[PDB]
Amino acid sequence: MNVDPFSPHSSDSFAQAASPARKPPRGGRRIWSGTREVIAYGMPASVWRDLYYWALKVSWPVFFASLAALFVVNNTLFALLYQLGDAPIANQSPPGFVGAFFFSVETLATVGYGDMHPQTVYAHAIATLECFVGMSGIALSTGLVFARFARPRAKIMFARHAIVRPFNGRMTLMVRAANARQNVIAEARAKMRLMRREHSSEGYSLMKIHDLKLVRNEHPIFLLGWNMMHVIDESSPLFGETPESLAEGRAMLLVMIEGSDETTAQVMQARHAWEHDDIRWHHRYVDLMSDVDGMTHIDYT
Amino acid sequence: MNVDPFSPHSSDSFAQAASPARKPPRGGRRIWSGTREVIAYGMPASVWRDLYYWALKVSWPVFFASLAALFVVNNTLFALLYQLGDAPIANQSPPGFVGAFFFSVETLATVGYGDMHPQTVYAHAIATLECFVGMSGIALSTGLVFARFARPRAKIMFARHAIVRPFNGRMTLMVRAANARQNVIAEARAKMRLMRREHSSEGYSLMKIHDLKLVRNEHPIFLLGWNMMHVIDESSPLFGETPESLAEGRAMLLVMIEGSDETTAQVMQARHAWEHDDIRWHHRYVDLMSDVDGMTHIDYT
Amino acid sequence: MNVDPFSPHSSDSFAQAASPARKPPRGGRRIWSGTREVIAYGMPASVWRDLYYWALKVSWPVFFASLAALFVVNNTLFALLYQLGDAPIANQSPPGFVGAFFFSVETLATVGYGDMHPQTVYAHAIATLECFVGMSGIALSTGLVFARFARPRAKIMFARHAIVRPFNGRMTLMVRAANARQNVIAEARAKMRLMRREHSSEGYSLMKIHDLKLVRNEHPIFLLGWNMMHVIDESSPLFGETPESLAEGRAMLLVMIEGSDETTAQVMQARHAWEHDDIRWHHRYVDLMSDVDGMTHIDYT
Amino acid sequence: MNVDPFSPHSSDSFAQAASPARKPPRGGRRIWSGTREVIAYGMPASVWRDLYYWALKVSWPVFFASLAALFVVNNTLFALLYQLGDAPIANQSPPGFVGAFFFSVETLATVGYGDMHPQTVYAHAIATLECFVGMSGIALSTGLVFARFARPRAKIMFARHAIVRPFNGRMTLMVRAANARQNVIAEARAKMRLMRREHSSEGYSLMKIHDLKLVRNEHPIFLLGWNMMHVIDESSPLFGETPESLAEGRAMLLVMIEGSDETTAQVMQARHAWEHDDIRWHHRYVDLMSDVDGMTHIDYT
């Protein structure tokens, strides 16, 4: 009966999104593609490695199916080899290449029991090559499988519109962080992208912006549900941030969150940018506003 | 006959906790749960991944049992398939589905020897699917096993009450670090959580506190048994730290310790927070106090 | 129909280098060698580990061939053992050691089906040792395979000559970054190596140079195609950088780029140094210059 | 014919230590022990994990032998089970438990061919349990094997006595770095341990020392063979470093070196401390002194 840990016995957690589950996934910067990145498209030699990338993302149901497809294709190739013209391997329950398929599945996977017919050395060599390849394939598939597990998932990026509301008599901006996975130790850094008035982009196009203020007062260590926030009044590029000026430039607000996961420690980072028109007025100050009386932590979308 | 390394030939090390071993484990922030974090409960789609989490923590005896249970269940499902209605696979030592169980165990695991009866193609297809699934399962189990080993253990968090005692004519606070595993290179950072007097929590609720002082004079590199300590007299929020004031706010002292393990290098971190009432008066100054005359390092609880 | 992601449906990406693909790879700091580093050559005990290194780099086609070669060699050694002089294992389809080869391949890899002849205990012991070794070998090969995948590729180093051109009425230097793989979050640090005029190298030979300026105004977070740049006019060693002076010293410009890959997070770094004569005059200011009207991102060499 | 890379075609690299190879290894902080650390000895529950540690260090020849020993022991236990009293499994080439050993090796490892005798269900259950355990064991052994490879080796710590020699008319201290493996990107930090004159150790015993000066002018990025160095003349605790004073305290000089390996990126660190009497006078200024005329890099001990 701990204060927070008793929470899971509460009502269903489906409030994040029950209905959208049946709807397709959030594909916006992660749509099905053979590219790793839109800029990465330039490398042409990458075609081999593209498969690696492909096998890494959609792989939950697709990988198993893909592996099965590869199995069938590879096995049939073997069957064709069986028909090559050396003394054939027969005496399998199904006559013809079907029989070849039947014993060869055992070879390209594990190893055949009563299919004791390596009568011809040519057939044997073919089978031997298949054995080597098949065990190699198993290692490859297992390696890929582990690699997929190794890849962590960063749902921490979330998606929410920035809100510019006053706080402490000072104009400020606020961003919603995500607690979707094991988020317990993240820290964040804010980057902004403003274009100068004179930025015809013939010179130092795209002025990089250092806005440490979003995280400066906000250093988030008790990350169980922190919000990031900067102050406008100080000396910062954001002073002149009126909407029209922001619109003129390609004002982009970028926030990155990264830290250990408490789980096997990997530094998981997240990238999320919001457009200048994604900023919202102070009217959003109403916030989530807990509906349950008392200090309670609730997650609703 | 080195100075410290001769120590293991001394008396039993059981002083950390011999009797408590039979008692249940320290479940306080790590109780058996299907949640990853109390906040993480909100994500509902996580149910699949919950199993991953589950298989990662309690897994020492439970994993093997679980795997066996899965084996039995999966195998019996196969047996049911054997009874599907195609020409059945018989001619196994035990008649009936028991025989099916007997040969199928070989298929869903490794591969059957004298159970050379893939007489019917329908039976064969069923067996083939089982073979594919079984080898996949082996890869999955091995992957999970390695992943578990990959997860490091951080006993370094320990548990001890803070002590506010005077030192060098200056009021200070002290925290006991843990040397439970391979702790040789950790470094630490201190975070505090104070509530403002005016913190009705309608504004910037929960004032984050930067208290680098705990580690500031204490940078711990010779980590073989270091204690962390801050100074109150300087300008710090802790100046006004009288107990009544601390009680009013939800004064929380948080200390994190992290560094390489000398072992395959992973950055292992630890999180441990102590309540404001977990702070103890200066009377704790007596310390462990070595009982063995001379400079000796002893670990007793 | 996103702004950048629609790009892959454009023309072929082969512009990075279609013809050079048939030409040998860029071997300059990575030529075929048994050394790990030119300085690493000094360690002689490393000969065993040299193989590890060797198996890690060229391994795409070479590893499979090497493994096959090892298989043949190891298997033949087993065959020799078969001929040791204990009662021989015969009754294999091919008489003689060929038969030994035939059944032994099954033993040193997976396990033999109808080769049920462990008639002599001496033969059996030999086979048993082979079984143990073979399964160990499989584990070793799979481990090496995964390790290779674990190794990331850093094409991000690229190769381009530095350009010293004026910008904003201030003399500056510019370096081309690479987007060849998944480069999305890199950051960079600049190091320089100048020799003092008086540097007879009898004292503090080789004055290390701190040139943070290359990245100082350039902190690259929107890394989709950033260029690094320092300023000469400020107080920096580069003020006196006239070509003759640079030539006198062994002026070396070193830039390192590193950051998370968004992929399983590993910190991938890159090292690339350019000679003092690799610096080019301001005439290179023409830049790539997009040929497609409008703001477009194109990758051409 | 590159400048440094042609070096390996030179004379033998054995100069690091040809004869000492036959001599036992440098066991000083890494002697055969069941402890992870001298302080780690305190945890008693660690006994299980001690084996993990043990299997990780000496494992090059020992692991294979250990595994074989475990195989024999586990297999014999199975044989005992065969003799349990259920209808026995006979009809193996060797009569008695020897036969049991013979077929059981196939079960606890891979899977038996002509040993088609699971005649009794009790025998079968025993064999089945063995199959499950054996495959699990294989996974465990492979996991351990990969884990060992994952562990990097840091020979970079080296061992050399500090030298306090004058440089640039300023008293300085110098330390020899090691290039033994793939050392290309390390950086270093210096820590010192001095005891105060008044340090009866009743107060803040052991004054931690921040000596960033060793690396301050020395930031080592061109790490192909850099030496670390601090300056005494500035304000530093080292000003009063006369030998007698150092002797009074337990002056310890600690230097840590860490950075990416260019190899699969792991941050490999190294810890090495030197006693106050390990410091040497300025007479060591003679240095290695290259014997080969011209600027050449040679590694001799």
Instruction: Give the pairing type, strands D163-167 and C170-176.
Output: unpaired
- Rounded Cα distance between D197 and B129, Å, is 77
Q: What are phi and psi of B81, to 5 degrees?
A: -65, -35
D142 touches C: beta carbon within 8 Å: yes
Let me know how long chain A is: 301
Residue in B37, B124, B203 closest to A102 by CB = B124
**Which backbone phi and psi does D218 adopt, to 5 degrees?**
-95, 0
Q: Which one-letter amino acid corresponds to residue D35?
A: T
Residue B86 carries which side chain, given as an amino acid letter? D
Chain B residues whose beta carbon lies within 8 Å of the beta carbon of residue A67: 136
Q: Is the dihedral of CA D141, D147, D152, D158 positive or negative?
A: negative
Contact A179 B39 (CB under 8 A): yes
Query: B231: which DSSP letter?
Result: E
CB A210 within 8 A of CB B196: no
SS (H, E, C) A208-256: EEECCHHHHCCCCCCCCCCEEEEECCCCCHHHHCCHHHHHHCCCEEEEE
**Counting Cβ atoms within 10 Å, is residue A217 exposed (0-12), middle (13-18) or buried (19+)?**
middle
User: How far from each other are the two terminal CA atoms of chain A, in whole angstroms?
Assistant: 27
For the record, the structure tokens of C133 come out as 């070794």
List residues bridging with D257 in a β-sheet. D188, D270
Distances (CA, A) of C35 to C43, C46, C136: 10, 9, 27
Cα dihedral angle (B197, B198, B201, B204), rounded to 10 degrees?
A: -100
- Give dist(CA C223, CA C221) in Å, integer: 5
Which phi and psi (to 5°) does residue D158 adopt? 55, -165
- Contact (CB, 8 A) for D95 and D69: no
Q: Cα–Cα–Cα angle for A153, A158, A163, nearest 5°? A: 160
Q: Which residues pair with D252 in a beta bridge?
A: D193, D275
Torsion angle (degrees, nearest 10) of CA D79, D83, D84, D90: 100
CB-CB contact of B150 with B142 (8 Å) = no
- The contacts found for B285-289 with CB under 8 angstroms, 24 or more apart, are B285/B163, B285/B165
- Domains in chain B, please, with CATH? 40-150 (1.10.287.70), 162-284 (2.60.40.1400)
Given the DSSP bridges, would you call strands D252-259 and D268-275 parallel, antiparallel or unpaired?
antiparallel
Residue whose token pair is 């493996």: D181
- Gap between the Cα atoms of D122 and B151, Å rounded: 38
Among B106, B111, B68, C137, residue whose Cα is nearest residue D136: B68
| Torsion on CA atoms A18, A19, A25, A28, rounded to nearest 10 | -100
Conformational region of residue A262, where left means phi above 0, alpha means psi within -120 to 50, and beta covers everything else? left
Please tell me the distance from the alpha carbon of residue D225 to that of residue D178, in angstroms, as a whole number: 7
Q: Could you tell me where the DSSP H helices lie in B43-120?
A: 47-57, 59-82, 97-109
Give the type of residue at C155.
Answer: K
Q: A271 in contact with C at a CB cutoff of 8 Å?
A: yes
Strand order in the sheet with A268-275: A207-210, A187-194, A252-259, A268-275
C-beta separation of C257 from C273 below 8 A:
no
**CA-based nearest residue to A173, from A187, A186, A192, A154:** A192
Considering only CA atoms, which of D267, C266, C152, D273 is closest in space to residue B221? D273
Distance spanning both ends of chain C, measured CA to CA: 27
Strand order across the A163-167 sheet: A163-167, A170-176, A227-231
Other C-beta atoms closer than 10 Å to the C-beta of D68 total 13
D208 interfacial to chain B (CB closer than 8 Å): yes
Plot region of C85 (φ>0 → left; ψ -120 to 50 → alpha; else → beta): left
Interface with chain A: mutation pick from B26, B29, B39, B156, highest number of A CBs within 10 Å: B39
| 3-class SS of residue A271 | strand
Torsional sign, CA D62, D63, D68, D72: positive
Q: Is D107 annotated as a binding residue?
A: no
- DSSP secondary structure letter of residue B160: -
Q: Is D263 on the interface with C (CB under 8 A)?
A: yes
Token pair 């441990």: residue: B272
DSSP state letter for D257: E
Contact predicate A40/A58, CB 8 Å = no
The encoded tokens of residue D142 equal: 């492979």
Which is nearest to C299 in space by CA: A43, A34, A49, A35?
A43
Q: Given strand B207-210, what is the order of strands in its sheet?
A: B207-210, B187-194, B252-259, B268-275
Give the span between the Cα atoms of C185 and C226, in whole angstroms: 11
- Please name the chains neighbouring D, where neighbouring means 3+ C-beta pairs under 8 angstroms: B, C
Q: Is B179 helix (H, G, I), strand (E, B) or coil?
A: coil
Q: How many CB atoms lie within 10 A of CB B181?
A: 21
Q: Which of D153, D125, D132, D98 is nearest to D266 (CA)?
A: D153
The reply to whether residue D139 touches residue B155, judged by beta carbons under 8 angstroms, is no
Q: How many CB pairs under 8 A join A and B?
A: 147
Which residue pairs from A22-31 have beta carbons closer than 8 angstroms and sit at least 24 positions apart in sequence? A26/A159, A28/C2, A30/A57, A31/C2, A31/C5
The set of long-range contacts for D196-204, using a CB threshold of 8 Å and a minimum separation of 24, is: D196/D249, D197/D248, D199/D249, D201/B295, D203/B167, D203/B168, D204/B167, D204/B168, D204/B229
Radius of gyration, alpha carbons of chain B: 29
B84/B129 Cα distance (integer angstroms): 14
A with C: how many residue pairs have Cβ under 8 Å apart?
147
Which residues fall within 8 angstroms of residue D118, CB to CB, at 6 or more apart? B93, B102, D89, D124, D127
* Smallest CA–CA distance from D102 into chain C, residue: C124
Q: Quick check: D92 and D119 in contact, CB under 8 A?
A: no
Distance between CA atoms of D116 and B110, rounded to whole angstroms? 15
Q: Which residues of D146-184 are buried (b: 16+ CB within 10 A; e: fewer)?
A: bbbebbbebbbbeebebbbbeeeeebbbbbbbbbbbbbb
Edge-first strand listing for the sheet containing D207-210: D207-210, D187-194, D252-259, D268-275
What whole-number distance in Å separates Cα of residue C285 and Cα of residue C283? 5
Of C121, C139, C268, the CB nearest to D265: C268
Task: Specify the experimental method.
Answer: NMR
Widest CA span of chain D, in angstroms?
91
Q: Looking up tokens 């280098």, which residue turns up?
A: C17
Interface of C with D in 53-82 (CB under 8 A): 56
Partner D contacted by C141 (CB < 8 A): no
End-to-end CA distance of chain B: 27
Where b means 16+ CB within 10 Å and e means fewer, A251-285 reads: bbbbbbbbbbbbbbbbbbbbbbbbebeebbeeeee
